[PDB]
Amino acid sequence: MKRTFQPSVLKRNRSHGFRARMATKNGRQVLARRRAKGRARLTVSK
Amino acid sequence: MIREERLLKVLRAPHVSEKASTAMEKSNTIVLKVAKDATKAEIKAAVQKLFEVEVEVVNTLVVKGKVKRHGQRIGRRSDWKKAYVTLKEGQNLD
Amino acid sequence: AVVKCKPTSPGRRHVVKVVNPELHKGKPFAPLLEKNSKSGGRNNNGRITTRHIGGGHKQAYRIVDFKRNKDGIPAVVERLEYDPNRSANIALVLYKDGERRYILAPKGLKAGDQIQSGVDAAIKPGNTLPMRNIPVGSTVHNVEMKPGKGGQLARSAGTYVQIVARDGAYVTLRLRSGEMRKVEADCRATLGEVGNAEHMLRVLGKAGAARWRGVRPTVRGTAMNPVDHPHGGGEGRNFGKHPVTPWGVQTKGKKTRSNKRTDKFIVRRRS
RNA sequence: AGGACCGAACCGACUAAUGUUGAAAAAUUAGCGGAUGACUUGUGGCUGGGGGUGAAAGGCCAAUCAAACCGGGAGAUAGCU
RNA sequence: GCUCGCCGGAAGACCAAGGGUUCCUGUCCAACGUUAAUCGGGGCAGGGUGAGUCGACCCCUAAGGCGAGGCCGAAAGGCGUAGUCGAUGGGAAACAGGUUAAUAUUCCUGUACUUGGUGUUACUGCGAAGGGGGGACGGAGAAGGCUAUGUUGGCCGGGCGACGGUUGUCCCGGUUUAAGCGUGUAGGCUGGUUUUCCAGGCAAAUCCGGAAAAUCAAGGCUGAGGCGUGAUGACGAGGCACUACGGUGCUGAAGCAACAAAUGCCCUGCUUCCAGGAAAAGCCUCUAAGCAUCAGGUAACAUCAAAUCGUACCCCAAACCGACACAGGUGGUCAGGUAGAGAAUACCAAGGCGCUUGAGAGAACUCGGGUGAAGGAACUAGGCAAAAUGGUGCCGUAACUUCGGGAGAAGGCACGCUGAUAUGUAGGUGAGGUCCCUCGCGGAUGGAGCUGAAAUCAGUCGAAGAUACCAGCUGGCUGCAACUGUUUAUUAAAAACACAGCACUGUGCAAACACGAAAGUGGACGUAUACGGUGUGACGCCUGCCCGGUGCCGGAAGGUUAAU
Ligand SMILES: [Mg+2]
Ligand SMILES: [Mg+2]
Ligand SMILES: [Mg+2]
Ligand SMILES: [Mg+2]
Ligand SMILES: [Mg+2]
Ligand SMILES: [Mg+2]
Ligand SMILES: [Mg+2]
Ligand SMILES: [Mg+2]
Ligand SMILES: [Mg+2]
Ligand SMILES: [Mg+2]
Ligand SMILES: [Mg+2]
Ligand SMILES: [Mg+2]
Ligand SMILES: [Mg+2]
Ligand SMILES: [Mg+2]
Ligand SMILES: [Mg+2]
Ligand SMILES: [Mg+2]
Ligand SMILES: [Mg+2]
Ligand SMILES: [Mg+2]
Ligand SMILES: [Mg+2]
Ligand SMILES: [Mg+2]
Ligand SMILES: [Mg+2]
Ligand SMILES: [Mg+2]
Ligand SMILES: [Mg+2]
Ligand SMILES: [Mg+2]
Ligand SMILES: [Mg+2]
Ligand SMILES: [Mg+2]
Ligand SMILES: [Mg+2]
Ligand SMILES: [Mg+2]
Ligand SMILES: [Mg+2]
Ligand SMILES: [Mg+2]
Ligand SMILES: [Mg+2]
Ligand SMILES: [Mg+2]
Ligand SMILES: [Mg+2]
Ligand SMILES: [Mg+2]
Ligand SMILES: [Mg+2]
Ligand SMILES: [Mg+2]
Ligand SMILES: [Mg+2]
Ligand SMILES: [Mg+2]
Ligand SMILES: [Mg+2]
Ligand SMILES: [Mg+2]
Ligand SMILES: [Mg+2]
Ligand SMILES: [Mg+2]
Ligand SMILES: [Mg+2]
Ligand SMILES: [Mg+2]
Ligand SMILES: [Mg+2]
Ligand SMILES: [Mg+2]
Ligand SMILES: [Mg+2]
Ligand SMILES: [Mg+2]
Ligand SMILES: [Mg+2]
Ligand SMILES: [Mg+2]
Ligand SMILES: [Mg+2]
Ligand SMILES: [Mg+2]
Ligand SMILES: [Mg+2]
Ligand SMILES: [Mg+2]
Ligand SMILES: [Mg+2]
Ligand SMILES: [Mg+2]
Ligand SMILES: [Mg+2]
Ligand SMILES: [Mg+2]
Ligand SMILES: [Mg+2]
Ligand SMILES: [Mg+2]
Ligand SMILES: [Mg+2]
Ligand SMILES: [Mg+2]
Ligand SMILES: [Mg+2]
Ligand SMILES: [Mg+2]
Ligand SMILES: [Mg+2]
Ligand SMILES: [Mg+2]
Ligand SMILES: [Mg+2]
């Protein structure tokens, strides 16, 4: 069957990447939460 | 004119290999490990000055580093840059 | 000319084409074209505002002269063309100085006739002149509402508006709906009925022919669930309620005009 | 000419059997429907939860839908076990 | 290593996406591999990806995103102008051969090409954020011209047969060659040319558009393929030699013709239809300010530059998405033979596999199949499932009907092989020869050679000739829905939804309506032959009575009635 994860790096980075998070206000609050939690990988972006 | 200080930092090492020994004797091409940000003109200027030899053309490729496991900890070697420097005919180099 | 199709397949059983052999069998005039991107009935919010719109054949937009400002300069009619953007056919006209434009084609207009706008224009089908120069009782189309704004009334394929009166600054019109409306006597109008009068005699014949025109299918409201529509629900076919919109506004009879700005311009409503 | 006909690719899923701690969290096998059209498909885009979207089954919205998911109010409340 | 079996419109080959070293070599076998393992996509170490032409970057825009100012909004923010992003589309150029354990249109050999720089020499209207042209566009259909490629002949090399025959109308193998450059062909489009004038193209214009007049019918544009060159090359069966048995070195024949032929190419054509079929830049051209002998412009030649990033490997899969080395899913490209209408299907080529537990035994029972006496739906909720029908041609074909259908109705006959007609026909193809010619990739004539159905007659074999695979069961009555379509991903495909049609009603345009505190946007760059909503649901005949109730519409004299 066709499963729900059909990967595409272009669509992965436009939707969840670094500059897509820094574009909006709430996305900047997402990166502030992950830095407060202390994430190694701060975003998707390789 | 590429500055003389940069040309001393372009070349890292010669690359010893079975393919490197073949290219030296057949196509008269040496194989060099170069700095990663070095371009083809910087290599051609460096080899023509620091080795005193006439360069015909320089082909480059980037070697991706392998992923190794020291013990159980994962790790990745560095990406490095590789240059096939074809000397002109008659020219010779150690 | 209406052409009943022979029933070689169901879906051609009920088709009546409207075949006009005078339309140009070629590409339209390329400088007067521009892109007309489809919408799907969706606004800048992405939501569907108006339903049932979507799909259909790609359509290029034809820039049509409604303002009709080239006064005094006569123009000959080069050819008649098909316009996908509208129900009426359009006419490619050539002015004397070398400018080509598109107008709405009137009823009796054919290729080779001369038209002319301006006040000193004659009264033949095709001329455009302000309605203080047009005699009372004549049928005009492409009528402006404001002077110089461009024609807005009686533009669909077989329509026309009669000029029934004039009292100084205003003329009184008999719109195609039957509504009597006052318009200023300086607004331009184009003589004669507009052309493609047999457009309403077509029958699309099959369901796909409406999808060709970008009309997605309409689900009637009683075929839904009560969360979807006020008509929805029921165990069987139940409709025990007054007919409303999907938003709960009465449809069978309830009036919706709420413009108190233009009430001075309406003489009598439609009947 | 055709929402024309027969029929592969392709799209779909009518019937039966198997399978039901499966090869598979819906499939296989033998048949079956459509197959120039309201067709199908790649890539990219847009619509966000009382909201979307729906040729309308309360269908679908990341194996979840008569109101998604995640975090918070939060140790909701529980005359019940 | 020799056999056997399997795929072969794939279970072969090339990619994109995705993965990220799984690639190659050495070495190791604990764990991992549903068993063992010396093996591996496992561990460990080393090696491997070479570009001016491929791709990305870059130039250009689509949907769309962001958005200076701006407008709007308690705040956050929303929308949007100028702009600036954004491919999945537009935009310069490289092929053949060779080579590595592993890369190659990237290296090597050979032969090209493109765009920029500078520099001389000749030449002199250059100049844009502007004008115009071009780019530049649909579906279906019809042929014609080709090529890829195949077959046969010729040609060259080899063979003379484990068992009867096989020096021949015998067997096997080969018969390959590019981009570029030259030629401008089949064929497609097009009237050219000069001058005068011009309310248009925001100003300008020699350009485009429009008027004239004159002259010439014949110029131009596009164009597959062929031919020549590229190529005295390269490649080539084999031999000749060494042999780490893997290989490496050397040498090298013939290298033609006919016929068939694409879904590829001419073709972004041509014809036709209605549902009327992107944008922008590169490119071409016109002038504006400007520049005046300077700059720039094109022309030749020389020289220089063409960076950076990607390039391994799998890619219908053991490497991607499915927790698995998972019978699933996954877009593009390539398309050999025989039979066949065919990309079906059977068997094969190239190529790749035998699916990572085996060995026995030959119980019940289960699974997937084969055949069956006599009967033939008695089974059963129900002919569920099985079985049967199945092709082509010709004959023939009912009720009913919207005259299209029904209909492949039903039903039946023929079908192999060989010979003859005819040592291969009709047809196709079309060489020499001859004639003509604005002379060529020309036009006739001409029929060699090749290819080749179909039919009749005669004969002959079997139980059976559409012999396998493949491949409609048919008819009668009737309910519902007109139909094609749609739907509950994962128990419901239906009479449900949709539908063309019909009607009611709203809506005069800053439309009704919808999304939005708003600005705005959709409706729609539409204008009552239009748009929204609602019901009904092709078509045919029709659609009766009731306005008391509940709604809606119209009324404005009276009663009642809010803030004030
Ligand atoms: Mg090179
Ligand atoms: Mg590179
Ligand atoms: Mg509608
Ligand atoms: Mg309707
Ligand atoms: Mg409906
Ligand atoms: Mg329902
Ligand atoms: Mg409700
Ligand atoms: Mg009922
Ligand atoms: Mg009732
Ligand atoms: Mg069909
Ligand atoms: Mg479905
Ligand atoms: Mg199946
Ligand atoms: Mg079919
Ligand atoms: Mg229900
Ligand atoms: Mg779900
Ligand atoms: Mg909710
Ligand atoms: Mg709730
Ligand atoms: Mg609380
Ligand atoms: Mg609790
Ligand atoms: Mg590894
Ligand atoms: Mg390997
Ligand atoms: Mg190994
Ligand atoms: Mg062991
Ligand atoms: Mg083991
Ligand atoms: Mg390994
Ligand atoms: Mg390129
Ligand atoms: Mg934009
Ligand atoms: Mg701002
Ligand atoms: Mg914005
Ligand atoms: Mg850009
Ligand atoms: Mg692209
Ligand atoms: Mg490109
Ligand atoms: Mg390889
Ligand atoms: Mg332009
Ligand atoms: Mg086409
Ligand atoms: Mg050929
Ligand atoms: Mg023998
Ligand atoms: Mg013998
Ligand atoms: Mg032979
Ligand atoms: Mg050539
Ligand atoms: Mg590769
Ligand atoms: Mg494969
Ligand atoms: Mg698999
Ligand atoms: Mg396995
Ligand atoms: Mg085949
Ligand atoms: Mg097959
Ligand atoms: Mg196995
Ligand atoms: Mg047994
Ligand atoms: Mg049987
Ligand atoms: Mg029996
Ligand atoms: Mg027997
Ligand atoms: Mg019997
Ligand atoms: Mg019985
Ligand atoms: Mg019984
Ligand atoms: Mg059955
Ligand atoms: Mg059967
Ligand atoms: Mg009954
Ligand atoms: Mg039906
Ligand atoms: Mg159907
Ligand atoms: Mg279901
Ligand atoms: Mg089902
Ligand atoms: Mg508006
Ligand atoms: Mg109904
Ligand atoms: Mg009634
Ligand atoms: Mg009443
Ligand atoms: Mg009454
Ligand atoms: Mg009232």
Residue numbers in the entry:
A (entry chain d): 1 to 46
B (entry chain T): 1 to 94
C (entry chain B): 2 to 272
Authors' account:
In termination of translation, the complete protein is released from the ribosome by a class-1 release factor (RF) recognizing one of the universal stop codons (UAA, UAG, and UGA), signaling the end of the amino acid encoding open reading frame (ORF) of the mRNA. RF1 and RF2 read UAA, UAG, and UAA, UGA, respectively, while the omnipotent eRF1 reads all three stop codons. Each stop codon in the decoding center (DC) is recognized by a stop-codon recognition (SCR) motif in a class-1 RF, and all RFs have a peptidyl transfer center (PTC)-binding GGQ motif, named after its universal Gly–Gly–Gln triplet (GGQ), for coordinated ester bond hydrolysis in the P-site bound peptidyl-tRNA. Further cryo-EM work showed that ribosome-bound RF1 and RF2 have extended structures, facilitating coordinated codon recognition in DC and ester bond hydrolysis in PTC.
